[PDB]
């Protein structure tokens, strides 16, 4: 077949109940992530293959970057609460690897309020209970399919994207292959 399980994507031994239809997992101290992000916007070309409506969902994990990767978790949980990751997603990423300048929950803090998320409304959701659970919530959803690497995408709770066997020569070719295989797998 033109799409095979182990070339474009991989099916879970142990499949996903009740999963986001378009779940992916990312870090702020992942590269190809910041790729993801800044030089391939997959999220929005796989968003424009879908079914207008579908949901899509983005969680940040922890086993990337100690102490500060947990506080982005947490920060990740703050930018879903108060609905700003399109204001804090490309500062964060460059905040942790082009500039290097971000090396506390301090400095996440001062990211959002560059953003212009007012300094009360940041601490309120920090310590709030609502993204207590938004961390719970992260967490869960990545050790239901005991994730080791990032960026990730998952269908249905059932497949994976296989970005290994795509073709890396043109971005553009990547972006379509990836998004195609999306639209592919949502409709299986
Ligand atoms: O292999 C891995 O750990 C998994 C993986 C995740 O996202 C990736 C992106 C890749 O290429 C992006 C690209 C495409 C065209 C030109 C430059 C860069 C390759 C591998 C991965």
């Given at each position: 077949?033109?799409?095979?399980?182990?070339?474009?994507?991989?099916?879970?031994?142990?499949?996903?109940?009740?999963?986001?239809?378009?779940?992916?997992?990312?870090?702020?101290?992942?590269?190809?992530?910041?790729?993801?992000?800044?030089?391939?916007?997959?999220?929005?070309?796989?968003?424009?293959?879908?079914?207008?409506?579908?949901?899509?969902?983005?969680?940040?994990?922890?086993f990337?970057?100690?102490?500060?990767?947990?506080?982005?978790?947490?920060?990740?949980?703050?930018?879903?609460?108060?609905?700003?990751?399109?204001?804090?997603?490309?500062?964060?990423?460059?905040?942790?690897?082009?500039?290097?300048?971000?090396?506390?929950?301090?400095?996440?803090?001062?990211?959002?309020?560059?953003?212009?998320?007012?300094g009360?409304?940041?601490?309120?959701?920090?310590?709030?209970?609502?993204?207590?659970?938004?961390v719970?919530?992260?967490?869960?959803?990545?050790?239901?399919?005991?994730?080791?690497?990032?960026?990730?995408?998952?269908?249905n709770?059932?497949?994976?994207?296989?970005?290994?066997?795509?073709?890396?020569?043109?971005?553009?070719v990547f972006?379509?292959?990836?998004?195609?295989?999306?639209?592919?797998?949502?409709?299986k």
């Amino acid at each position: 077949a033109q799409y095979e399980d182990g070339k474009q994507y991989t099916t879970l031994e142990k499949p996903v109940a009740g999963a986001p239809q378009v779940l992916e997992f990312f870090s702020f101290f992942c590269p190809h992530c910041y790729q993801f992000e800044e030089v391939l916007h997959i999220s929005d070309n796989v968003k424009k293959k879908l079914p207008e409506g579908v949901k899509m969902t983005k969680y940040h994990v922890n086993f990337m970057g100690g102490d500060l990767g947990k506080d982005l978790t947490q920060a990740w949980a703050v930018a879903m609460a108060l609905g700003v990751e399109d204001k804090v997603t490309v500062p964060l990423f460059e905040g942790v690897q082009k500039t290097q300048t971000i090396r506390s929950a301090s400095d996440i803090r001062d990211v959002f309020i560059n953003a212009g998320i007012k300094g009360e409304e940041y601490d309120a959701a920090w310590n709030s209970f609502v993204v207590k659970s938004l961390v719970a919530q992260q967490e869960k959803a990545a050790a239901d399919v005991q994730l080791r690497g990032v960026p990730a995408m998952f269908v249905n709770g059932k497949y994976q994207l296989n970005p290994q066997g795509m073709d890396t020569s043109n971005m553009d070719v990547f972006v379509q292959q990836y998004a195609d295989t999306v639209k592919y797998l949502s409709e299986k």
